[PDB]
Design a protein around this ligand. Structure first.
Ligand SMILES: *[C@@H]1O[C@H](CO)[C@@H](O[C@@H]2O[C@H](CO)[C@@H](O)[C@H](O)[C@H]2NC(C)=O)[C@H](O)[C@H]1NC(C)=O
Ligand SMILES: *[C@@H]1O[C@H](CO)[C@@H](O[C@@H]2O[C@H](CO)[C@@H](O)[C@H](O)[C@H]2NC(C)=O)[C@H](O)[C@H]1NC(C)=O
Ligand SMILES: *[C@@H]1O[C@H](CO)[C@@H](O[C@@H]2O[C@H](CO)[C@@H](O)[C@H](O)[C@H]2NC(C)=O)[C@H](O)[C@H]1NC(C)=O
Ligand SMILES: *[C@@H]1O[C@H](CO)[C@@H](O[C@@H]2O[C@H](CO)[C@@H](O)[C@H](O)[C@H]2NC(C)=O)[C@H](O)[C@H]1NC(C)=O
Ligand SMILES: *[C@@H]1O[C@H](CO)[C@@H](O[C@@H]2O[C@H](CO)[C@@H](O)[C@H](O)[C@H]2NC(C)=O)[C@H](O)[C@H]1NC(C)=O
Lengths: 345, 345, 345, 345, 345
């Protein structure tokens, strides 16, 4: 019979009185909007800005009894996105947008379908710049959790209620990678139900668990700083009398410990509180620092003054042979207490 | 009875003569607009640009006797954001915007309610890029104060007056963090009342006190530069005669003091005036610098010329044993006078 | 006769009933849209963001029997881009846009031609910010593959079908360069045919193979780190007794191995998993590290204690003459196993 | 009587024939538009891009005899910014915009007042990204001058003439700071009067003098590089025979002179011509370079060959005692000629 | 008589049938559009993105016999930019835009004049982000050529033809500087005449020759790396027996050669192929590398074993006195062959 574009103008026009500024079931029960998203892209998790951008589909389903039809034979319709302003749509927004936009390439990326009984499917495509607060206390060994919450804006709880559908509430695209994190397959789903001095506004959220990878920070920041500490211990096996050899090994080890730490401030984030990589790069500075102060003691005792010249030279060898075993044992005690308290947490 | 969207077109149309270009109470008392904000997001406090961005709600309440109604039974209404251009709204703007924008995702994030007596509630959602001038004289030990002021633009003092409401004038969202600062729970509220050659324009402002965290700059910039100064003092306990050991300890300590300072210019801001971290990294350069000039004196006196060869070698040991105690005492006097004058301020 | 702009208003107006919201061949066979692109610009392949931008022409051809004409004499027409909203156009979009826009400089860069039988040519100009996931396991020796896929949005498989034309489906502009990659002349063309819970949506894609150039990373990151390992081997030819000469060569070689690696973290990407350049810069750290621990053994055996003073000094020369040949042989075995497993892959 | 919004529609409508596309005083004298600006924000003076952004008010005053009224009683009016397109406005633009925009937060930030005799006040709020060419020949000791010029675009000299008003032509906001510069209170005001092949177009400009602060570059780039040169002179007081002590002091001083210069390339701008900080960091490299070549002469003469073994060892001490006094005297002559020629200019 | 705005509505209205969608001289000769540009700003030549932005005026002149008038007395008119959509304008675009925009500050920056015979002048103001491929083979000694080409989009060769006018086709603003390049006063002008599978589209282009300045790269990258090579040669004048002095001079010279190269990777571009600065910083690494391997030979021959102890100590002095003259002669041969092949090219 008549084409669907003319059939919807009969259904939504000034005939039949469909006003797009009044929600369905007016002065009655609230509207049960159900939602599910589909994540196309995900990433660029900035940590100075503390945000991440995501590229989603947003599928919304509700019921509208004013749009029920029976004369037209086909079981479903589709409104063109040009005529989309003549339909009541929920005023969904994201409570932590921090900037967002649509996509308008070659067509508005907006889909609208109307079933026969009046169920309405509405699917759009959004780029979000969502903000999640991050906790970089233990920086390589951290688990970040970045939420994504969907409030209503104008309609309160008694007029409009969001729901996650019980059939795949969050799907993720297949070949999706990240430069630093991995995305677990555990999506929490819970209500939040914001209160203001304006009213009870509904909101639903979805939590994403992010686990930071490790293999880069071991190879270039832990293991090289580990080897600089090992090169401090070889002063305790070099002779006592070789005075240019000991202190030439001394400061040039604390120089390369500073050079290791100074160049690595570009790759690390720029927060103003102490990390767990920063405790490692500061305690490993102290062992190189304490490995020279040992020799400042040995050089002073051996130079100190025949019977007494043999007694002091035997006491200075005693503090050497103690420090060969006892001081690498101290570093292993730190190395145990470090990795326990940053894998339990 | 009739739906609220048709009731507002009777109330705002060409019938009843409501013109949206004339403020309420025209040729009479001024309009008492009262305001309060709600901060969703806050951060990215750039210091090269000297600004910070914030994501707020902006609630405005005023009275409009032309919008008073009694026939419609419900105690409140809500205008749809499409029909929002047919209401007088105040021309509020921020005196230090430096760029801003709305959010138009899935609906204009704009709320309008009309009470029965004519009170109007208007709530929108704005991202600001507000500018605050910063004073980095004492850089780690600083308290920044970044204002947020709300002028009127077209209406003068006798027509429109802003007010902070006496019931929660600034609320902040709960789980809100910052990468470098902490946000105190002390919001000042004061008038500013701008004058121009155009007229008296009202404005209200809200001050935010920011306190910079400390723990990163201690662990990687103060304490490592502190340990380099301690490694200068061990030259005074090494023997006088070990000439490659003293100067090999000398310059390699002033090399790692430069290497500590040179790599840290990326994390620091790029202002062109002297900070308090810059005084520390320059005075601690002088103690490493002065620890070698001591040895340049000792090597010259001991080489200088039997009776006189014993007298000079005893004078050069005198200037060593003085400098073992007196020069670390000088550094503690600087270390007292530094931290006093940057914690009193 | 009559001008073509007035002839198209007769063809597309309310006369003849051409509605731009109904696809051609409605309630019949699907529409066979055929496509080919023309790449003007290409590049800025970011790897933190994992995307690349491209500037294309997008030529679309389909058939529309409602636009067939015979009265007007000329064999082709051209609709002005102002009147472009009165033509059914396919809702093509890119499945990995991540932001895109048109160009509207001096005229909308949009072309539309209508042939006599009803074939329609439609050519536009788009800047894309397409996203491709990258795999930086073997970072200098990698072959990246960045796809470009073109879904439909609103119309399912039974209504609209995309095709690559069989005559030059992807052309590339002539003098097109890249800062880091080279673009092979092998463009794959395959279907993808997306499924959702909404329906079967057609999509076609084109793969681009990118091969990273090598010559920068050899000259400044492999060859200089190669020469630092060679400067470790000259300690095995310097005398055993020259104790300041050996360890002064020792740590100052592991200092310049760290200095080589620390400054190169700015040019490298910032992923959080181990690369192939990172294995090279860590194993070459171990050979410089192991070249000093050899001397810590030699200095301890030779100092260890006449008959036994000759036996130990001959054993310490034995471990030197073994390490002159055997340890550069170990490095060549690593140097073989490295370049084999990163050129086979 | 009647409200001012309806009185202006009588004044600007199709009644009385006010056409907004014809300037006042048509086919007569030119229009004397007078202007003054008010700088709210100022800064982010980039030097790679060679631009600076500024946030101004722009007040324009002209006369329009068609807008003169006498029936309405009040002495001034105000047109709403929605109805602003029905007024002739000058086509002022900035000759070095390089991008700019308005502000449209909560209302267009646009003001229009009409006096009784026909004087029109028009005030808007603009963010500019104005471009000024910079001359970094003498980089810390420079005085930058960044202009701000306001051409007309369509109207020539005989139709429209800009003027600075004689009452506060440029005001600046009170608490306005900059990260690197200071803004002098000397605003030049002069005409520029652009010619083209199109016609004489009027323009007025305002010069701003910027003076770069100094205190950061002294503390971290001049004074530390000054101390490295002083540590070269202590080789001339260390003994001649201590051969590892002299060259160990030699290269480790030219290493820390390179380390000082290499890390400072991030803070400096990236121009491709020689600065004044670059002459300092290159000449101070030569004094450390020449302080070792002195010892290469001393070590060769003293090793050169009893009577002649005493003569050469007395000649090598002669070139030492000359270089103790004469070479720090040469550096002071450079230090005089440097600071004179970069403070006169 | 009647004002010009009403005279153009008679000339362009539905009276006289001027349709703005049909080019002048329809079904006849093509339109001879002539063009010339005026460059206001120029710069920010990025090399990672391989583009540059420019701020131009764009003057277009063509003839339109439908706009010829004789009744109105004045010899020229000017259409207001609001009524600008009622004029046929050429669909000029730039073939390498990569993003562009107009300027709409206080008025659309668009000019239109109509002469009496029908010549039309049209001048607009555009910011371009034009893309030019760059060839950084010889990086400091390069001459870049960045084109600027102006295609037609919809009209083919037989309908519209672009021309450069024979009277000043490209003017440049007077005080125009660049941070790294200089702009020669030699503007090439040639046709390009693009072909597609769509048709012959006209295009004209203008080449700009850019010559990179040199003075920064000499003072801080060539001359300092030159002096490090000179400090290698002083080992050949220091005594053979001073074993800590030679290798302490050895590695600390190859450390500062790496430190010179490592810090300079931030200022250099990030291409992935070998430059000419990279050949210099790698060959100058080899001379410092080869200056130590000489001493590894000398220390091994002199230690090798009375008659034979005199013969080897005289052979090791022979290889020293050869290397004092012969090896700085080798570096000058490289220094000749380097600067010849990078100034001929
Ligand atoms: C939307 O969902 C809510 C809850 O799922 C429904 O509200 C309840 O509906 C049942 C039967 O109509 C009543 O027994 C309850 O009293 C209602 N309230 C609550 C709090 O449970 C509501 O009917 C649904 N509305 C529509 C249009 O489906
Ligand atoms: C808006 O607030 C101001 C001050 O709160 C009111 O102005 C005063 O109103 C009282 C009584 O009407 C007078 O006694 C005063 O003379 C007024 N002026 C001042 C400076 O105090 C004003 O009435 C309020 N307007 C509305 C509509 O509420
Ligand atoms: C579009 O292309 C498809 C396939 O190329 C066509 O569909 C087939 O058309 C032939 C003859 O009309 C039939 O025998 C087939 O049964 C059709 N289906 C399939 C799956 O092959 C279709 O006709 C084309 N439509 C137009 C307007 O050209
Ligand atoms: C705008 O200002 C100019 C100059 O200030 C005026 O032009 C002069 O006006 C006086 C008297 O009208 C004449 O004697 C001069 O011959 C005019 N020209 C010059 C070059 O001085 C002009 O009248 C003013 N126009 C308006 C509307 O105020
Ligand atoms: C536009 O310029 C072209 C060439 O300058 C003109 O085309 C030629 O015009 C002359 C005389 O009209 C003919 O002899 C030639 O045969 C034409 N073609 C060529 C290829 O030279 C054209 O006439 C001009 N059109 C207008 C409106 O000026």
């Amino acid at each position: 019979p008549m084409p669907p574009s003319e059939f919807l103008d009969k259904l939504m026009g000034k005939v039949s009185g469909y006003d797009a500024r009044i929600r369905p079931n007016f002065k009655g029960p609230p509207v049960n909007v159900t939602c599910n998203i589909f994540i196309n892209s995900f990433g660029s998790i900035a940590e100075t800005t503390m945000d991440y951008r995501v590229n989603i589909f947003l599928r919304q389903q509700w019921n509208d009894p004013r749009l029920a039809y029976s004369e037209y034979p086909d079981d479903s319709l589709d409104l063109d996105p040009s005529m989309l302003d003549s339909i009541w749509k929920p005023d969904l927004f994201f409570a932590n947008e921090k900037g967002a936009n649509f996509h308008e390439v070659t067509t508005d990326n907006k889909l609208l379908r109307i079933s026969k009984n009046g169920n309405v499917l509405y699917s759009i495509r959004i780029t979000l710049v969502l903000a999640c607060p991050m906790d970089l206390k233990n920086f390589p060994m951290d688990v970040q959790t970045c939420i994504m919450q969907l409030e209503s804006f104008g309609y309160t709880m008694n007029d409009l209620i969001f729901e996650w559908d019980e059939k795949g509430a969050v799907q993720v695209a297949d070949g999706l990678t990240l430069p630093q994190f991995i995305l677990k397959e555990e999506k929490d789903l819970r209500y939040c139900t914001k209160h203001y001095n304006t009213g009870k506004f509904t909101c639903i959220e979805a939590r994403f668990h992010l686990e930071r990878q490790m293999g880069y920070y071991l190879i270039q920041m832990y293991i090289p700083s580990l080897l600089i500490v090992i090169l401090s211990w070889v002063s305790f096996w070099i002779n006592m009398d070789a005075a240019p050899a000991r202190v030439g090994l001394g400061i040039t080890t604390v120089l390369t410990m500073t050079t290791q730490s100074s160049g690595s401030r570009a790759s690390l984030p720029k927060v103003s509180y102490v990390k767990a990589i920063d405790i490692w790069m500061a305690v490993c500075l102290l062992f190189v620092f304490s490995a020279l102060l040992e020799y400042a003691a040995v050089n002073f005792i051996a130079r100190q003054h025949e019977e007494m010249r043999k007694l002091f030279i035997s006491r200075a060898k005693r503090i050497d042979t103690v420090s060969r075993v006892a001081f690498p044992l101290v570093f292993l005690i730190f190395n145990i207490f470090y990795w326990i308290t940053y894998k339990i947490i």
